Design an enzyme around this catalytic site. Structure first.
Site, PDB file in Angstrom:
ATOM      1  N   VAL A 494       0.863  -1.177   0.000  1.00 18.10           N
ATOM      2  CA  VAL A 494       0.000   0.000   0.000  1.00 18.10           C
ATOM      3  C   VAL A 494       0.901   1.229   0.000  1.00 18.10           C
ATOM      4  CG1 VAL A 494      -1.845   1.233   1.166  1.00 18.10           C
ATOM      5  CG2 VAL A 494      -1.783  -1.269   1.223  1.00 18.10           C
ATOM      6  N   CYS A 495       0.879   1.982  -1.098  1.00 15.92           N
ATOM      7  CA  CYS A 495       1.784   3.113  -1.291  1.00 15.92           C
ATOM      8  C   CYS A 495       1.133   4.373  -0.735  1.00 15.92           C
ATOM      9  CB  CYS A 495       2.136   3.273  -2.765  1.00 15.92           C
TER      10      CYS A 495
END
Lengths: 648, 723
Positions: A494-495
């Site tokens: 998850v960026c």
């Protein structure tokens, strides 16, 4: 509305008669304003608005992408590119030859090896570092060997000389994209150029027409499914991933006619079901040529790289030895080079046209090539504490961290902070037997491409938490096509900055503020701008088409999450998912709103005028090409509801 | 060497002015210009009723503080320890405000406590138990010239002050009592459980008479400065019959490890501060790892010299000998003296498994807030203004304190641990009962919760399946990660010692595996230590994740910093903290070898770091090195029985080919013989000093012989494969 005028790397003519190149615009990694671009006129560099300068010529290359306008969904690929200060009229590209002997990074050939020049040593009037406009010493970092030989011949040819100077310097390789570009070239003692350019364009619908660059606009940010005639892509049906060659693409309908190479027939395909991305052979890529019978050593259209630079290139030692040798210098047709060449053109029949260094164009199959890798740029509780952690957890088979003694104090605070301000859309489940593992479920907000869709994230806390951010692994339930969001990777990462602008801090950041950030920042109405390289185009006119093509993709893949959520059982959330989709009637809404959306798209099948009332609707109209893939997920979503209604 | 006297919390006296007594709070080597670091032979001390930090030689011992349940020895050099079973205290008394010393020494049997209740005590209402956490007490103060003026606040006041000049406190009346309730009576049925509610938060006025004080016998030991009163016997002024203890003389009844009992003067004894993890005492319930089944036994006697113990298996009923290293007690896992427990109903059990103690405490969240005390302050001020006028009730200072036979026999204090496994429990009714361990449930106090062929580096093709992080979801890292690892891979191949091995992998570069050989003259001499490594998503900014493969059993750790659960304890792994610039993965390996695997690993615990060569930690050092040696040889067994992915043939070249297995079996059997000859001698030989493990105790030989049997069969099968 906010259209973009000037793009990067082209030439621009503000006040006087007797231009400049710009290296900054609305696309930025000095910050710019809504309408000003960088510039650097040189016969200084200022920051002037776009209202002053005017366009004179734009620079394209064989392989670059352009459109007639930023709103035209149809795109095209460039096939060929078509007044000078003396330090009458113009001169054609064939009436001037580059007197530049060697440039920094140009490929050379010796024995059966190939390398690139990493350092130079020019001497004009001192010798150092080059970058001035007579080279003497060249430092080659040989890359790979000729792939057209036998192991007995391969082991014979070793790594050649690392330093070349004097009379030893041959085969200089030219690029069909570097010609006719402030360069120094003469022919009846030097001439510097100060230009008119036209490009031969190949459109997506097969049409080929040459036009002026002043009418075209570069296409720097293409969609992941965008393909062009002649490209080798992968047709990914749920039954099998077939190899096809693109023949024509109707970007308006988001469909394409591709030739299944195993069958040889042309069938209609949905562009959303084509996964080109590297695999293939782009126009301009330097590739080796194997022998007949021998292949690339690879499988279906996936030409491999062959780059292999030595380590002495990544140092900035060796420069002292090269400088000492250079200082001692100034004191006192046709051939067998048919195993190398760059990609000239891609034929529609799956054959690749390679141009040899001897100006001899050849047509070879894709399996006989090998790409070159140069130096390059490298019942609905919001929060519960479940007893046992699920076996399907991402970190269930991961060694549990020990944390400390005060770690349970923070977890007591986080558990309350969750139960306090957690909306009924986000669900969190904690485990006592695994106090280091958490699992969250975010329901997509309204009026978003993720509307009424499940988003499960398995969490893990490090032994240094809360000093370290929580490790989030996103369960991406995609069929391998693409990411449901530019930040939500298919690999689980998850960026975000909150899970790493700001960062993660035990003083301000929290699990609650991170979950509401994922729902608030990631799952939005126009998720195409979630990519950091696209956030500068919020509401701009040159980012409208890309947002439509992505929200459609996000809406189709969002329904696929409902398929897997109701198929595979999520540990600790099985009853929670049935209460939402089967009890409260959300699966009927997902199936219903999609059915009404497909019907409304078949009505305006040829109408490109989106109704003003359907504006701001996340996905107002469907493409009829992406509908082809949506009926597959809906067919499985309907079959699951059929088994649900039949149970009672 | 470096001997140390004057342990914390006793009573001392200066060599000059033999009328003042000290409180000695800061002890040398423990953890304003005062509270500064103290050097070798410096203790801090406050005086009754001017703080200073003086050397130890200036002060002189007077009395020592011991409570029932504490541990003690005759001297730090003694291996045999004991437990205090009873404390007798006689003390001189002096009037608090009159400063008149009563002639003669008085016993605790003829004196009582002046304060009815204080902070931290226990109270019982209905069938609930709670702890007083905050008090609002309005008190009186004798002004310089008469005037017994009242004063409203936050407790911490007693009879006797020192400043608005030299005023004397005449009374201390606790009005509002904030009671943090813990849990209810565990004997009531689940139906009657809901019928009893959680009582009020604040208690005052006529409601005080409904409470029930619970006096701790371990705290009834008369301390210096306590406000006490003579049982029906100087009154000074409102009457003020409150006395202050001048000095004390404590005598304790000791139960030694060898089952013997005797009464001693506390001036001869020395408190056993940090005991060995295997230290047991007669009457304790411990676990016995005899083979592959942990059994429930009760300790009857312990031979601290030979490190053996006689235990009684409760399942069978027989008394058998057991090595103290094989016993795995205290995990809480047994009732200790002075602890408060819940006597369950007849038949009902503790609900836990084999000798376990269930916890009770449930501190409500308002106790940890910061608030409700402002409402308590406004409550106390409202009490004072109305207490003078009509319509107000105050005092009623009863709070039960029963002495008959009330139905308060559901919650008491542990008095004695009998050898037959039974536990003697004293009820608030001043009457004792005998109950089995299953009928008891320990009370988790609120203060307890608030306080708590060889090479060196070869990039292997694939990461093996036995890797700890083989099943973890891989991260994505940054771009400059392979470049950082390239510098890391270079740094490993640069200055790696031959005792440390590192193997990276190509299929997933985020995982590594290490192996360290314990240096010579250490309890880890020629032993394998493998750590599974994983690189974080934010590496190298974040420290590397290290999981130590502790091949130990359920006894203890091979090192105080190497947990049985894999967590490696070192500041370098997030010494200095982890740094992406200065710190590297190589120095994390050499620090584990250089700091965690030392000659005396007992000092690796940061709490014991201030004890280095001092005559106190000499005993616990060799006690720990013996365990670290027995568990180290056990790692050789687990390293040859099962193969390690990557180290498959690296282990065979070192232990089987290089003959280090015969080195381990040879060095072990040599220590067995040397320990048999030096057996019995209470003193350690001279020429055998500076050796990591000079001797193995009789119990230490037992647990090692079981590993040697499996270590010999591996040598037997190796020499049998010579076909």
């Amino acid at each position: 509305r906010a259209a973009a005028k000037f793009y990067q790397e082209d030439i621009v003519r503000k006040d006087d008669s007797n231009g400049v190149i710009l290296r900054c615009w609305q696309d930025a990694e000095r910050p710019l304003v809504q309408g000003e671009v960088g510039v650097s006129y040189f016969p200084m560099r200022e920051i002037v608005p776009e209202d002053t300068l005017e366009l004179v010529d734009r620079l394209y290359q064989p392989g670059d992408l352009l459109k007639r306008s930023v709103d035209d969904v149809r795109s095209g690929v460039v096939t060929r590119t078509h007044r000078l200060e003396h330090a009458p009229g113009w001169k054609s590209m064939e009436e001037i030859e580059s007197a530049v002997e060697i440039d920094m990074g140009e490929y050379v050939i010796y024995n059966d090896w190939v390398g690139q020049v990493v350092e130079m040593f020019d001497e004009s009037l001192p010798e150092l570092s080059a970058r001035l406009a007579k080279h003497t010493v060249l430092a080659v970092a040989w890359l790979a060997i000729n792939q057209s030989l036998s192991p007995e011949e391969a082991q014979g040819k070793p790594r050649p000389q690392r330093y070349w100077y004097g009379e030893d310097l041959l085969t200089t390789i030219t690029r069909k994209a570097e010609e006719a570009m402030g360069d120094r070239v003469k022919l009846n003692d030097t001439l510097v150029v100060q230009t008119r350019t036209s490009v031969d364009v190949l459109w997506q619908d097969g049409t080929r027409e040459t036009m002026d660059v002043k009418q075209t606009v570069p296409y720097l940010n293409p969609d992941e499914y965008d393909c062009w005639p002649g490209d080798h892509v992968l047709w990914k049906t749920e039954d099998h991933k077939r190899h096809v060659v693109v023949q024509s693409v109707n970007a308006q309908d988001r469909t394409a006619y591709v030739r299944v190479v195993e069958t040889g027939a042309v069938e209609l395909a949905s562009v959303l079901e084509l996964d080109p991305h590297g695999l293939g052979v782009r126009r301009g890529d330097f590739v080796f040529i194997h022998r007949e019978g021998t292949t690339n050593g690879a499988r279906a259209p996936m030409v491999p790289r062959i780059g292999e630079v030595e380590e002495w290139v990544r140092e900035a030692g060796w420069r002292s030895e090269m400088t000492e040798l250079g200082s001692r210098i100034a004191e006192q047709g046709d051939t067998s080079l048919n195993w190398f060449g760059e990609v000239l053109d891609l034929r529609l029949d799956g054959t690749i046209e390679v141009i040899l260094p001897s100006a001899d164009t050849i047509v070879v199959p894709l399996e006989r090539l090998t790409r070159l890798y140069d130096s390059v740029e490298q019942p609905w509780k919001r929060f519960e504490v479940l007893p046992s952690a699920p076996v399907d957890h991402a970190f269930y088979n991961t060694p549990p961290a020990q944390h400390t003694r005060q770690f349970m104090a923070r977890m007591s605070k986080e558990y309350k902070a969750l139960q306090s301000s957690l909306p009924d859309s986000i669900l969190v489940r904690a485990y006592e037997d695994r106090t280091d593992l958490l699992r969250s479920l975010i329901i997509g907000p309204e009026n978003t491409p993720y509307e009424d869709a499940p988003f499960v994230i398995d969490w893990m806390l490090d032994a240094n938490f809360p000093q370290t951010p929580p490790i989030a692994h996103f369960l991406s339930w995609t069929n391998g096509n693409g990411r449901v969001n530019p930040n939500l990777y298919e690999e689980g990462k998850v960026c975000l900055s909150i899970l790493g602008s700001e960062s993660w801090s035990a003083s301000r950041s929290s699990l609650l503020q991170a979950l509401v950030s994922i729902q608030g920042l990631v799952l939005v109405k126009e998720p195409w701008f979630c990519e950091p390289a696209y956030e500068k185009l919020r509401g701009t006119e040159d980012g409208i088409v890309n947002s439509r093509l992505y929200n459609e993709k996000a809406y189709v893949l969002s329904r696929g999450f409902v398929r897997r959520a109701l198929e595979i059982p999520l540990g600790g959330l099985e009853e929670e998912l049935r209460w939402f989709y089967h009890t409260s009637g959300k699966l009927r809404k997902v199936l219903g709103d999609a059915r009404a959306l497909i019907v409304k798209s078949t009505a305006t099948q040829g109408d490109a005028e989106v109704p003003e009332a359907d504006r701001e609707r996340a996905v107002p109209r469907l493409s009829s090409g992406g509908i082809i893939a949506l009926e597959r997920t809906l067919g499985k979503l309907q079959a699951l509801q059929d088994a649900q209604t039949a149970t009672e």
